[PDB]
C-alpha cells in the first residue's frame, strides 16, 4: 500500500469539460422551512409575544400568546423563492419577538436574531435542529440577553435530500446553552463590533445619464444599508467617506454588497456591484484575524458601457450574473473594531453612520507599472449564422484600455481588421484567416500587485493538478481500469508536493512596504492551511486502498474546494480581459479570461495556465441570452494566443506561438525588433488528416413528439465540418461511420501538439421533415495525434472507442461512443497513413470497432400497466417490440388489454452480437406499440435500458460458505395500558438511537424506516423490473415538464443476457427448462383479488396551502378504479397532522397495483389544493421474494398491543416459504424447537392469551425462523418486517422539493386466503381528563403599587389571577384584598382547571376556534403550565401587573414551607432547587416567588403566593366535588 502512479492513465484529458452555461445567475427553486418551537426567558413586563419570522423581504407571524415570558408556538413556516444561489444565500433570516402588534400599530421589539441563508446551508445537513436563537437588542449595544427562541431552520434546493430527524416526544430537560443557534466555532457570547467600509475613490465610470454621471456608493451588510455623498459630474469621483455599520461579531451574515449607483431623480440605477466575502478576508480562532481589506482596488463588472434608454442586462449591474464588460474600479477598504460595550464613554446607538474616512494616497495600492497585453487570433470558426454575413471584428479590452468605442510611442491596436465570414455549413461560419492571423496589442497601467496573482496562480496550479488527478481517478474508476487506488496515491503525493512548493514560493517579496494587512494575514493563513493540507494529504495517502478509494476521492474533493476557496484573491489588481465579437459595430458575444491566467512569470508555478498558450475560447451571449434556446448555438470559437505581463518582461512574448511565421508590423514599427506585430504571416504549414470514428451514441435527447429522434452528428475541426448519416426513430443510433477530414492545414509547427491537440466539437441534431434540425446536444473531444515519424503501433494505436459526455446546455443529453485520431501526412505522402478499407460511407475500421461475441437476450414479458391515451384513442391491442443492436424479438399480441394485460408467451429470446467489453454494450430498447388494423401501428411509448449490466447473468458463487447447507447451526432466542402508539414511540426512540450510533426492551417494537420501504429492499426488483415508457419531447431543466409527465405507461418484466455458448453445468445449475429458460421460480401470472389496507399514521412538515400559513389535510387514496377522498375527516389548521386512519380497497392485482396516497388541503370555497402525493407500486411488493405483503412482527402474541396482524400464522408462513423454496422443513419436534434446512432454532414453547394461562404452540420458534430467514442456505432472503415507512410527498406543480413526509405502511392480503380481522386501532390517543385545583391561601410581601394622593402612604389592592390553558379560556380571579399596607393578602380562593391531557406528549389538548370568524374548531396542544399572577385593582383605570410565576406542571420547583424560606432562586436559573411533577406527587403545598422585570431588565421579587396544587382525574373529581371560590361543596374561610 505504498506504490503509486504519478502519470495520467486514462484518456480524461482527451475529453474536455467545456460548458456554455455557468452556474452564475441561474435561478433555482429554494425553500426555507422554519419551525418556531418555543421561546424562553423573554424580557418584558406582561408581554404578549409574537414571533416574527422574516426571510429576505417576506415576513410571517406566529399566533399571539397571552402574558408569558416562556411561550410555546410549534408553528411551521415555508418561504419559497426562485432565485440564483448567490442572491438566495445573501437573504437575511431574522427571527424576532414583538408584542402589542395590531391592525394599525407596529409591534414593540423585544429582541432579534440575525443570520443568513448561507450559514444555514453550510451546516452538515443544510439545517439546524432544535437550536436556540440568541435574541439581542439590535438598537442597543449595552443591552444584554433578550431571550432565546428554540427553532428549526432548514434550507433545501431543487433535488436536495435531507435526513430530517423524526418528531418524537420532547419530554426532556433540554439545555439552552449547549444547543445554541450558532455555527461551529462561533462563541456563545458575541461582542458588538463596528464595520468601517472605507470608500476612497473610483475610476473609469461609463456613461449613465444620456452625458455625465453622479455616483455614490451604497453598502449593504446584514440587512442594514448606508450610502456616501453624491459626487456630482465626475467620471473619477473622490469620496473619502466610510460607512460604519454596528453589528454582532462574528457576523452570521457573511457577505457584504458594495454597489456604485448613479443618482437621478427619474430612476436610480446601479453601475456596478462587488461582493466582499467575509469568509475570504477573515479567519476564526486564536490563529485567526479580524476582517480586514485594502486599501486596494476592486474591479466591478456588469452590462455593456454604451448608453441605452432601457437595459436588458441591468441585472448584471446589480451583480446578479456574470459581468460582460468592465464598469468601474473602486478603491476600497474594511476594518473591524470590537467595541467595549461596558464603557459609557461611547454612544450605544447602532445606526449606520457615514463619516469622513482618513484619505490615503494612490501609492498605497502599489506603484503603477506598464502592462503589455498581446493577442493572436489563430483561428475563428463556428460563428453563429444568425448574426448575419456582415464583416466581423474581435475587440479585446482590459479595463477601459483598448475600448475605443465605450471606454474612457506605441499606439494600441485593440481590434482585428474586419473580415467577411465564409460558410462552413448551414448553421456556422468561419473567418478565413489562413496563413494571416490578426493580432492585437494593448498598453495598460495597473498598480504592481503581481504577488497576489502569483500566489493565486500557484494555488490554482495545485488545484488544477488535483482536479485533473481526481478526474482521472473518477474516469478510470468508471471505465474499470486496473488499480484505481494507485493513481489516487500519486495524486495525493503531487498534492503534498505542490503544497510544500507553495510554502517555498510564496515567501518571496515579503519586504515590500505596499502590502496591506489583508495581504500579510492571508499569506499566513494560506501558508498554514496549505501546510496542514500537505500533512493531511500525506496522512490520507496511507488510508487510500482498494476498497476505500471511492470515499477518499470524496475526501480529496474537500481539498479541491478548499484550494479553490483559498485561490480567490479578494483584492483585485488587474481587471479581466474581455474578447468581444462585433458586426456592424454591435456587441454580439463575449468571453471573459481572468488576468491572473494570462500573467507571465519566470517561475513556472507563478505562471498563468493560459499565458503564452493558445487558448480555446467559446464566446457566449451576454446575460440571460446565454441560457436557454438562444445560448444553444456556438456564438464563436477562437484559438486565441494570449500573453500578459510587464512591458519590461515582453522579450519572450512570442515564444508560445507555433513556429514559422513572419512578423508584419505597423508603419511606426518598421526597423524595431521590440515592436509587436499587427499580424503573423505563416510560411510553414503541416498537412493533417482527422478520422472521426462516429460509432454509436446512447441516451440521447428526444426532440420529436414520439419520444424519439432522427440523430446525425456533425463534426467540426478547424474550419471544416462533415455529417454522419441520419438514422431514423432512435435515441441510440449506431452510425458506424468514419469521417475523414482530408488535407487539413495546421499553420505552423505547434509546440506540444501531441499533448494539447486542437479541440473537436461534435453536435447531435434531430433531422426534421422540412430541412430544419433541432439541437440535441454537444460534446467535445481531443484527437490522439500521430506524428509523421511515429509508428501506428500499440499501445497507443489504434485508438479505442470511449464515451464522450454530451450536454444540452447544462443538462446531460447522453454519451457518444467515438474515437478520434489526427494523423500527420508525412513527406512521403499519404502512403504512411493506415489503409482505409453503403456506397461512399466508410465504416469504422477493424481494431477500433468493438470485437463482437454472440449473446442471447431472454425477455420476460410480465404485463403492461397504466397505458395512457395515444393521440386521443384508448390502447386496446398492445405489443412490445424489443430491439438491441439491430436484432430483437416481438412479444405475443395482447388481444384485449382491458380484460387481462398479460402475455400468452411468458418468455421469448433472441440472439445478438454484443461487444466483448460489457461497458461498450449498446442499450436495449423497449418499444410498446398499439397494433391497429390494416398495419396502422402507432407508437405508445418507449423506454431505453441504458445498462445491461444489471441483467447480465453470471453463475452464482456456490463456493461461498452460505451455500454449504451441511452441519447443524443452533440459533437461540399499567402493563395493559399499552397500545400501538406505545410500540410506535418505542420504535421511534430506538431508531433515533440507531441513527446516533450509525453517525458515531420491555415494549416490543417495529422497524421505523426514515425513507421508503423500497429504499431498503432494492425497490423489490429481485425478479421483476419496471421500465417507464416515455413519449413526447424531453423538457428542459428550466420551464420544462420533467420526465414524470412524459411517462405514458409501464412495462413489467425482466431481462437476462448471457453468452450463448453456455457450459452444460452452468445451464443445469440455473435450471434451464425450455418453457421459461433462465427465469425460474416465476409466480403465477393469473389475476388475483388483493385486499389492500393502507394504514396512514401521520404527516410531518406539510407545505401550507392556505392564506393563513396552515392547511387542512385529509387523505385521498387512488388505487385502480377506486378513488377515495376523505374530505369529511380533514384536520383543521394543522401542518403536522396525526391521521391514525386505515383504508380498505379491494384491487384486482396485478392490474390495479399503482397505489397513490395523497394529502389534500380542504378548502371551503374553490377546489381542494394538492399538498403532495407518493406512488408505491404494490405489484413489486406483492410478487417479491422479500414477502412485502404483510410485515412480520418481532415477537408473537395473540392479544393486546402486540397482536399478530397477519391471518397467516408464523408456522403457516414458514411452511409456505419452505414449500415454495423446496427446503426440507419446517420440522417441528417438541414445541420449543424447529429444524429448517441445516439450521435449528429454539425459543419459548408457550403462548399467553388475554386470560394469561399457558398453552403450547410452535409460533414463537416459527417466528424466530422467519426473523432469521436470511441465514437459510438455499433460498434465504431478508423478509420485510412490520414497519412504518416515511414516504416523501411530491407535487408536480413544485417539482424537485419534498414538501411533506407521510408516515404509513401498506398490508396486502390475497382474498383467496382466509381474510384478516379488523384493522389495527392506530387512531390517536384519547386524552385523559383531569382537574387541577389551586387553592390560593395568602400572599406575602407584595409590592405596593398605589400612592395616596393626599397623605402619601403606599398600598396595594392585591388579587391573584390564575389560568392553565390560557387567558381567554381559563382565567379566574380572586376577590380583591383591598388596601394592603404591608403586602399581606388573605384570599382562601379555589381555582378549578378541568383539562384534557396526553401523558406521552405532556400536552394539554383543547378544541377551540382560531378566531370568531373561523369555520371550524382546531385542536391545539400547549404545555401544561399553571400561571399565577399578582395584580393591583384600580377603580378608574386598568389593573396594574405586579408579578408572575409560570409553573410547568412536570418541572416546577417545590414550594417553600414558609414565606420567609421562599427566595428568588426557586424560579430563576439556579439548579439548587429540586423539581417536582404534579402528575406523580398529586398534591403540593408551599410558597412560590413572583417575579417582574424592572427598567434595569433584571428580575426582582415583587411578591410571594401560598398555593396548594391538587391534581385529580375527572372521575376522582366527580366523586369528591368542590365548588369554585369559597362556595359549596367544601367551603373555604
Q: Give the binding-site size for ligand PSF (rule: CB under 6 A).
A: 14
Q: Which of 1092, 1091, 696 is nearest to 915 (CA)?
A: 696
- The binding track of 1052-1091 with respect to ligand PSF, each residue x by CB under 6 A or -, is ----------------------------------------
Find the shortest distance in angstroms from Cβ 700 to Ca ion: 12
1007-1009 β-sheet, strand order: 1007-1009, 1283-1288, 1301-1310, 1088-1100, 1141-1149
Query: Binding of ligand PSF at residue 1112 (CB under 6 A)?
Result: yes
Contact between 1419 and ligand PSF by CB under 6 A: the answer reads no
- Considering only 247, 318, 460, 1112, the residue that binds Ca ion (CB under 5 A) is 1112
Choose from Ca ion, ligand PSF, none: what does 1440 bind? Cβ within 5-8 Å by kind: Ca ion
Residue range at the interface with ligand PSF (CB under 6 A); choices 232-240, 283-291, 405-413, 1107-1115:
1107-1115
- Counting contacts by CB under 6 A, is residue 1169 touching ligand PSF? yes
Interaction between residue 1012 and ligand PSF (CB under 6 A)? no
Determine contact, residues 1017/1191, Cβ cutoff 8 Å: no
* Residue whose C-alpha cell reads 454612544 in the numeric block: 347
One residue of 629, 962, 1386, 1414 binding ligand PSF per CB under 6 A: 1414
**Burial of 1215 from C-beta contacts in 10 A (0-12 / 13-18 / 19+):** middle
φ, ψ (nearest 5 deg) of residue 98 = -125, 175
Of 1101, 832, 1072, residue with least CA distance to 955: 1072
Compute the half-sphere exposure of residue 1016: CA atoms within 13 Å on the CB side of its CA: 18
Number of residues located near Ca ion, criterion CB under 5 A: 24
Window 472 to 491, contacts with ligand PSF (CB under 6 A): none
Binding flag, residue 1107, ligand PSF (CB under 6 A)? yes
Figure out which of the listed residues 876, 1106, 1401, 1448 binds Ca ion, where binding follows CB under 5 A.
Answer: 1106
Pairwise CA distance, residues 1162 & 410, whole Å: 77
Question: Does position 1105 bind ligand PSF by CB under 6 A?
Answer: yes
Centroid of chain to Cα 181: 21
Distance CA 27, CA 83 (A): 4
Half-sphere exposure of 1391 (CA within 13 A, CB side): 26
C-alpha span between 731 and 810 (Å, rounded) = 19
Q: Distance (Å, rounded) from C-alpha 1268 to C-alpha 1263?
A: 9
For the record, the C-alpha cell of 382 comes out as 463556428
In Å, how far from its chain's centre is CA 1445? 45
Q: Identify which range of 285-293, 629-637, 650-658, 1165-1173 contacts ligand PSF by CB under 6 A.
A: 1165-1173
1412 near ligand PSF, judged by CB under 6 A: no
Site for ligand PSF (CB under 6 A): which residue of 793, 1164, 1315, 1438?
Answer: 1164
User: Which residue carries 456506397 as its cell?
Assistant: 839
List 1349, 1350, 1413, 1436, residue binding ligand PSF (CB under 6 A): 1413
In the list Ca ion, ligand PSF, none, the entry touching 1107 (Cβ below 5 to 8 angstroms by class) is: ligand PSF
Are the C-beta atoms of 61 and 226 separated by less than 8 Å?
no
* SS3 label, residue 993: helix
Contact pick of 671, 835, 840, 1166 for ligand PSF (by CB under 6 A): 1166
CA distance 1075 to 1063: 19
Please name the residue that has the C-alpha cell 469539460. 17
DSSP state of 325: E
Q: In whole angstroms, give the CA distance from residue 150 to residue 899.
A: 58
CA–CA dist 1485, 1465 (Å, integer): 18
Residue 1432 interacting partner from ligand PSF, Ca ion, none (CB closer than 5 to 8 Å by kind): Ca ion
Indicate the Cα dihedral angle 77, 81, 87, 93, nearest 10°. Answer: -10
Taking the complex as a whole, how short is the minimal distance between the CB of residue 1421 and ligand PSF, in angstroms? Answer: 18
Q: Is 456 helix (H, G, I), strand (E, B) or coil?
A: helix
Which residues, 6+ apart, have CB-to-CB distance to 543 below 8 Å? 552
The reply on whether position 214 binds Ca ion by CB under 5 A is yes
- Shortest distance in whole angstroms from residue 1293 CB to ligand PSF: 10
Residue in 931, 938, 877 with CA at minimum distance from that of residue 903: 877
Q: Name beta bridge partners: 150.
A: 38, 132
CB-nearer residue toward Ca ion: 308 or 363: 308
Closer of 101 and 126 to ligand PSF (Cβ): 101
Query: C-alpha cell of 1492?
Result: 417582574
Least Å from the CB of residue 1057 to Ca ion: 30
Q: How far apart are CA 857 and CA 889, in angstroms?
A: 9
3-state secondary structure of 1486: strand
Q: Which does 362 bind (CB under 5 to 8 A by kind): Ca ion, ligand PSF, none?
A: none
1080 binds, among ligand PSF, Ca ion, none (CB under 5 to 8 A by kind): none
Options 219, 495, 703, 1284; binder of Ca ion; rule CB under 5 A: 703
Q: Smaller CB distance to ligand PSF: residue 63 or 853?
A: 63
Beta-strand (E) ranges in 341-410?
353-356, 368-384, 392-398
Distance, CA of 232 to chain centre: 46
Give the C-alpha separation, 170 to 1141, whole Å: 24
1164 binds, among Ca ion, ligand PSF, none (CB under 5 to 8 A by kind): ligand PSF
Q: Does position 103 bind ligand PSF by CB under 6 A?
A: no
DSSP-derived pairing of the beta strands 28-40 and 1403-1409? unpaired
Report the residue number, 91 or 1103, with the smaller CB distance to ligand PSF.
1103
Choosing among Ca ion, ligand PSF, none, which partner's interface includes residue 1357 (Cβ < 5 to 8 Å by kind)?
Ca ion
Quick note: the x/- pattern for ligand PSF over 1124-1163, rule CB under 6 A, is ---------------------------------------x
Nearest alpha carbon to residue 206 among 329, 104, 323, 95:
329
For the CB of residue 1161, give the shortest distance to ligand PSF in the complex, in Å: 7
Query: Could you tell which of Ca ion, ligand PSF, none binds residue 1416, using a CB distance below 5 to 8 A set by kind?
Result: ligand PSF
Stretch that binds ligand PSF, among 81-89, 720-728, 803-811, 1407-1415 (CB under 6 A): 1407-1415
Question: For ligand PSF, which is the closer residue by CB, 833 or 1115?
Answer: 1115
Binding piece for ligand PSF, criterion CB under 6 A, among 1016-1024, 1414-1422, 1473-1481, 1519-1527: 1414-1422
Residue 411 within binding range of ligand PSF, rule CB under 6 A: no
CB distance 110 to 44 below 8 Å: yes
User: Which residue number, 1127 or 1255, has a Cβ lying nearer to ligand PSF?
Assistant: 1127
**Of 185-193, 546-554, 1054-1062, 1338-1346: span binding Ca ion (CB under 5 A):** 1338-1346
For ligand PSF, which residue of 729, 1038, 1416, 1439 counts as binding (CB under 6 A)?
Answer: 1416
1378 sits near ligand PSF (criterion: CB under 6 A): no
Instruction: State the Cα–Cα distance between residues 929 and 891, nearest whole angstrom.
Output: 11
Distance CA 646, CA 643 (A): 10
Residues 235-294 that bind Ca ion (CB under 5 A): 262, 264
Q: Indicate whether 82 belongs to the interface with ligand PSF (CB under 6 A).
A: no
Radius of gyration of the chain (CA): 39
The window from 523-531, 843-851, 1099-1107, 1222-1230 that contacts ligand PSF (CB under 6 A) reads 1099-1107
Q: How many residues make up the chain in this entry?
A: 1533
- Residues that bind ligand PSF in the complex, under the rule CB under 6 A: 1105-1108, 1112, 1163-1166, 1169, 1413-1416
- Residues that bind Ca ion in the complex, under the rule CB under 5 A: 209, 214, 262, 264, 703-704, 710, 766, 768, 774, 1105-1106, 1112, 1161, 1163, 1166, 1169, 1345-1346, 1357, 1432, 1434, 1437, 1440
Amino acid at each position: 500500500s505504498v506504490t503509486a502512479l504519478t502519470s495520467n492513465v486514462s484518456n480524461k484529458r482527451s475529453k474536455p469539460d467545456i460548458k456554455m452555461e455557468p452556474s452564475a445567475g441561474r435561478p433555482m427553486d429554494y425553500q426555507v422551512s422554519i419551525t418556531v418551537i418555543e421561546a424562553r426567558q423573554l424580557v418584558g413586563l406582561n408581554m404578549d409575544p409574537v414571533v416574527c419570522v422574516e426571510v429576505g423581504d417576506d415576513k410571517k407571524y406566529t399566533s399571539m400568546k397571552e402574558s408569558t415570558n416562556c411561550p410555546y408556538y410549534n408553528e411551521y413556516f415555508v418561504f419559497d423563492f426562485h432565485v440564483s444561489p448567490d442572491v438566495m444565500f445573501d437573504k437575511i433570516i431574522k427571527i424576532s419577538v414583538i408584542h402589542s402588534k395590531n391592525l394599525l400599530r407596529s409591534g414593540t421589539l423585544v429582541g432579534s436574531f440575525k443570520m443568513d441563508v448561507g450559514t444555514v446551508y453550510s451546516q452538515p445537513e443544510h439545517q439546524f435542529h432544535h437550536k436556540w436563537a440568541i435574541l439581542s437588542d439590535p438598537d442597543d449595544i449595552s443591552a444584554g440577553l433578550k431571550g432565546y427562541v428554540k427553532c428549526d431552520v432548514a434550507v433545501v434546493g431543487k433535488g436536495d435530500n435531507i435526513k430530517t430527524p423524526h418528531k418524537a416526544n420532547e419530554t426532556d430537560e433540554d439545555d439552552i446553552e449547549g444547543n445554541l443557534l450558532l455555527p461551529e466555532g462561533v462563541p456563545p457570547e458575541r461582542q458588538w463590533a463596528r464595520f468601517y467600509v472605507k470608500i476612497y475613490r473610483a475610476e473609469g465610470l461609463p456613461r449613465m445619464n444620456t452625458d455625465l454621471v453622479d455616483p455614490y456608493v451604497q453598502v449593504f451588510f446584514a440587512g442594514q444599508k448606508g450610502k456616501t455623498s453624491v459626487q456630482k459630474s465626475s467620471y473619477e469621483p473622490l469620496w473619502n467617506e466610510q460607512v460604519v455599520f454596528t453589528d454582532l461579531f462574528p457576523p452570521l451574515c457573511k457577505r457584504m454588497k458594495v454597489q456604485i449607483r448613479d443618482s437621478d431623480k427619474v430612476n436610480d440605477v446601479a453601475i456596478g456591484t462587488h461582493f466582499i466575502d467575509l469568509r475570504k478576508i477573515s479567519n476564526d480562532g486564536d490563529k485567526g484575524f479580524l476582517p480586514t481589506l485594502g486599501p486596494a482596488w476592486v474591479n466591478m463588472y456588469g452590462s455593456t458601457r454604451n448608453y441605452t434608454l432601457l437595459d436588458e442586462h441591468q441585472d448584471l449591474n446589480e451583480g446578479l450574473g456574470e459581468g460582460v464588460s468592465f464598469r468601474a474600479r473602486l478603491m476600497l477598504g474594511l476594518a473591524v473594531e470590537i467595541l467595549d460595550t461596558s464603557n459609557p464613554e461611547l454612544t450605544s446607538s447602532t445606526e449606520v453612520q457615514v463619516e469622513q474616512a482618513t484619505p490615503v494616497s494612490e501609492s498605497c495600492t502599489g506603484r503603477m507599472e506598464e502592462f503589455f497585453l498581446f493577442g493572436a487570433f489563430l483561428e475563428a470558426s463556428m460563428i453563429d449564422r444568425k448574426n448575419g454575413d456582415k464583416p466581423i471584428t474581435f475587440e479585446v479590452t482590459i479595463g477601459n484600455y483598448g475600448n475605443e468605442v465605450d471606454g474612457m510611442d506605441l499606439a494600441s491596436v485593440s481590434s482585428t481588421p474586419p473580415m467577411r465570414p465564409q460558410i462552413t455549413d448551414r448553421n456556422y461560419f468561419h473567418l478565413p484567416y489562413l496563413e494571416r492571423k490578426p493580432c492585437i496589442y494593448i498598453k495598460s497601467w495597473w498598480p504592481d500587485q503581481r504577488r497576489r496573482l502569483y500566489n493565486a496562480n500557484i494555488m490554482d496550479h495545485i488545484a488544477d493538478k488535483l482536479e485533473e488527478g481526481l478526474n482521472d481517478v473518477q474516469e478510470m474508476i468508471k471505465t474499470e481500469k486496473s488499480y484505481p487506488e494507485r493513481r489516487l496515491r500519486g495524486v495525493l503525493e503531487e498534492l503534498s508536493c505542490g503544497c510544500h512548493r507553495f510554502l517555498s514560493l510564496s515567501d518571496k517579496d515579503q519586504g515590500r512596504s505596499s502590502r496591506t494587512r489583508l495581504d500579510r494575514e492571508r499569506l499566513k493563513s494560506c501558508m498554514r492551511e496549505l501546510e496542514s493540507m500537505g500533512q493531511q494529504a500525506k496522512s490520507l495517502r496511507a488510508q487510500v486502498k482498494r476498497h476505500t478509494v471511492r470515499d477518499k476521492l470524496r475526501s480529496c474533493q474537500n481539498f479541491l474546494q478548499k484550494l479553490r476557496f483559498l485561490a480567490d484573491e479578494p483584492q483585485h489588481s488587474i481587471p479581466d480581459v474581455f474578447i468581444w465579437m462585433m458586426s456592424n459595430n454591435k456587441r454580439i458575444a463575449y468571453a471573459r479570461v481572468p488576468s491572473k491566467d494570462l500573467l507571465f512569470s519566470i517561475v513556472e508555478e507563478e505562471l498563468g495556465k493560459d499565458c503564452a498558450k493558445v487558448k480555446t475560447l467559446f464566446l457566449k451571449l451576454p446575460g440571460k441570452r446565454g441560457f436557454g434556446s438562444a445560448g444553444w448555438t456556438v456564438q464563436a470559437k477562437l484559438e486565441l494566443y494570449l500573453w500578459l505581463g510587464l512591458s519590461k518582461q515582453r522579450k519572450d512574448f512570442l515564444c508560445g506561438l507555433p513556429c514559422g511565421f513572419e512578423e508584419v508590423k505597423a508603419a511606426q514599427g518598421l526597423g524595431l525588433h521590440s515592436f509587436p506585430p499587427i499580424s503573423l504571416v505563416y510560411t510553414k504549414k503541416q498537412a493533417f488528416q482527422l478520422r472521426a470514428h462516429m460509432y454509436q451514441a446512447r441516451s440521447l435527447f428526444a426532440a420529436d413528439s414520439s419520444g424519439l429522434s432522427d440523430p446525425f452528428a456533425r463534426v467540426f475541426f478547424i474550419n471544416q465540418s462533415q455529417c454522419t448519416e441520419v438514422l431514423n426513430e432512435t435515441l441510440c443510433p449506431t452510425w458506424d461511420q468514419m469521417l475523414v477530414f482530408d488535407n487539413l492545414e495546421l499553420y505552423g509547427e505547434a509546440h506540444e501538439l501531441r499533448d494539447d491537440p486542437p479541440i473537436i466539437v461534435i453536435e447531435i441534431y434531430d433531422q426534421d421533415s422540412m430541412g430544419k434540425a433541432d439541437f440535441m446536444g454537444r460534446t467535445f473531444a481531443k484527437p490522439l495525434v500521430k506524428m509523421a515519424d511515429e509508428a501506428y503501433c500499440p499501445p497507443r494505436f489504434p485508438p479505442q472507442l470511449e464515451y464522450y459526455q454530451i450536454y444540452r446546455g447544462s443538462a446531460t443529453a447522453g454519451d457518444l461512443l467515438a474515437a478520434f485520431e489526427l494523423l500527420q501526412i508525412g513527406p512521403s505522402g499519404k502512403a504512411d497513413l493506415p489503409p482505409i478499407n453503403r456506397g461512399p460511407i466508410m465504416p469504422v475500421p477493424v481494431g477500433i470497432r468493438p470485437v463482437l461475441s454472440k449473446y442471447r437476450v431472454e425477455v420476460l414479458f410480465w404485463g403492461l400497466r397504466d397505458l395512457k391515451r395515444v393521440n386521443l384513442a384508448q390502447v386496446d391491442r398492445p405489443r412490445v417490440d424489443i430491439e438491441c443492436a439491430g436484432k430483437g424479438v416481438q412479444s405475443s399480441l395482447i388481444h384485449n388489454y382491458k380484460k387481462n394485460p398479460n402475455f400468452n408467451t411468458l418468455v421469448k429470446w433472441f440472439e445478438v452480437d454484443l461487444p466483448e467489453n460489457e461497458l461498450l454494450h449498446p442499450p436495449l430498447n423497449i418499444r410498446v406499440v398499439d397494433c391497429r388494423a390494416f398495419g396502422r401501428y402507432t407508437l405508445v411509448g418507449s423506454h431505453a435500458v441504458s445498462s445491461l449490466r444489471r441483467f447480465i447473468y453470471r453463475p452464482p458463487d456456490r463456493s461461498a460458505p452460505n451455500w454449504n447447507t451441511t452441519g447443524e447451526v443452533v440459533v437461540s432466542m399499567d402493563e395493559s395500558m399499552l397500545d400501538w402508539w406505545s410500540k410506535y414511540f418505542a420504535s421511534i426512540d430506538t431508531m433515533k438511537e440507531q441513527l446516533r450510533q450509525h453517525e458515531t426492551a420491555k415494549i416490543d417494537e417495529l422497524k421505523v424506516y426514515p425513507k421508503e420501504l423500497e429504499s431498503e429492499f432494492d425497490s423489490f426488483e429481485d425478479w421483476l423490473h419496471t421500465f417507464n415508457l416515455l413519449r413526447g419531447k424531453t423538457g428542459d431543466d428550466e420551464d420544462g415538464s420533467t420526465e414524470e409527465e412524459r411517462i405514458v405507461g409501464r412495462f413489467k418484466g425482466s431481462l437476462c443476457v448471457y453468452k450463448v455458448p453456455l457450459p452444460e453445468d452452468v445451464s443445469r445449475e440455473a435450471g434451464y427448462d425450455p418453457t421459461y429458460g433462465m427465469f425460474q421460480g416465476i409466480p403465477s401470472n393469473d389475476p388475483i383479488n388483493v385486499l389492500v389496507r393502507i394504514y396512514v399514521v401521520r404527516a410531518t412538515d406539510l407545505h401550507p396551502a392556505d392564506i393563513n400559513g396552515k392547511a387542512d389535510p385529509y387523505i385521498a387514496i387512488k388505487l385502480g378504479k377506486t378513488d377515495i377522498r376523505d374530505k369529511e375527516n380533514y384536520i383543521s389548521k394543522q401542518l403536522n397532522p396525526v391521521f391514525g386512519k386505515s383504508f380498505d380497497i379491494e384491487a384486482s392485482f396485478p392490474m390495479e397495483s399503482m397505489l397513490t396516497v395523497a394529502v389534500y388541503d380542504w378548502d371551503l370555497v374553490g377546489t381542494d389544493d394538492l399538498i403532495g402525493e407518493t406512488k408505491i407500486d404494490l405489484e413489486n411488493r406483492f410478487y417479491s421474494k422479500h414477502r412485502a405483503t404483510c410485515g412480520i412482527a418481532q415477537t408473537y402474541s395473540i392479544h393486546g398491543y402486540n397482536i399478530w396482524r397477519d391471518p397467516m400464522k408464523p408456522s403457516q408462513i414458514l411452511t409456505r416459504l419452505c414449500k415454495e423454496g423446496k427446503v426440507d422443513g419446517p420440522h417441528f419436534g417438541p414445541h420449543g424447537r424447529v429444524r429448517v434446512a441445516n439450521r435449528v432454532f429454539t425459543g419459548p414453547s408457550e403462548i399467553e392469551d388475554e386470560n394469561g394461562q399457558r398453552k403450547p404452540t410452535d409460533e414463537h420458534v416459527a417466528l424466530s425462523a422467519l426473523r432469521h430467514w436470511e441465514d437459510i442456505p438455499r433460498v434465504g432472503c431478508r423478509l420485510v418486517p412490520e414497519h412504518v415507512e416515511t414516504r416523501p410527498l411530491l407535487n408536480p406543480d413544485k417539482p424537485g422539493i419534498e414538501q411533506g413526509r407521510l408516515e404509513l405502511w401498506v398490508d396486502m392480503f390475497p382474498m383467496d386466503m382466509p381474510a384478516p380481522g379488523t384493522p389495527l386501532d392506530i387512531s390517536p390517543r384519547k386524552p385523559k381528563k383531569y382537574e387541577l385545583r389551586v387553592i390560593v391561601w395568602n400572599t406575602d410581601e407584595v409590592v405596593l403599587e398605589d400612592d395616596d394622593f393626599f397623605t402619601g402612604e403606599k398600598s396595594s389592592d392585591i388579587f391573584v389571577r390564575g389560568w392553565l390553558k390560557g387567558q381567554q379560556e381559563d382565567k379566574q380571579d380572586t376577590d380583591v384584598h383591598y388596601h394592603s399596607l404591608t403586602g399581606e393578602g388573605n384570599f382562601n380562593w379555589r381555582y378549578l382547571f378541568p383539562f384534557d391531557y396526553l401523558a406521552a406528549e405532556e400536552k394539554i389538548v383543547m378544541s377551540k376556534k382560531e378566531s370568531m370568524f373561523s369555520w371550524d374548531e382546531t385542536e391545539y396542544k400547549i404545555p401544561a403550565r399553571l400561571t399565577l399572577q399578582i395584580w393591583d385593582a384600580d377603580h378608574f383605570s386598568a389593573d396594574d401587573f405586579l408579578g408572575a410565576i409560570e409553573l410547568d406542571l412536570n418541572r416546577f420547583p417545590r414550594g417553600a414551607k414558609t414565606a420567609k424560606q421562599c427566595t428568588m432562586e426557586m424560579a430563576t436559573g439556579e439548579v439548587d432547587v429540586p423539581l417536582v411533577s404534579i402528575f406523580k406527587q398529586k398534591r403540593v403545598k408551599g410558597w412560590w416567588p413572583l417575579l417582574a422585570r424592572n427598567e434595569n431588565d433584571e428580575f426582582e421579587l415583587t411578591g410571594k403566593v401560598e398555593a396548594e396544587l391538587h391534581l385529580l382525574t375527572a372521575e376522582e373529581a366527580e366523586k369528591n366535588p368542590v365548588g369554585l371560590a369559597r362556595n359549596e361543596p367544601d367551603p373555604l374561610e
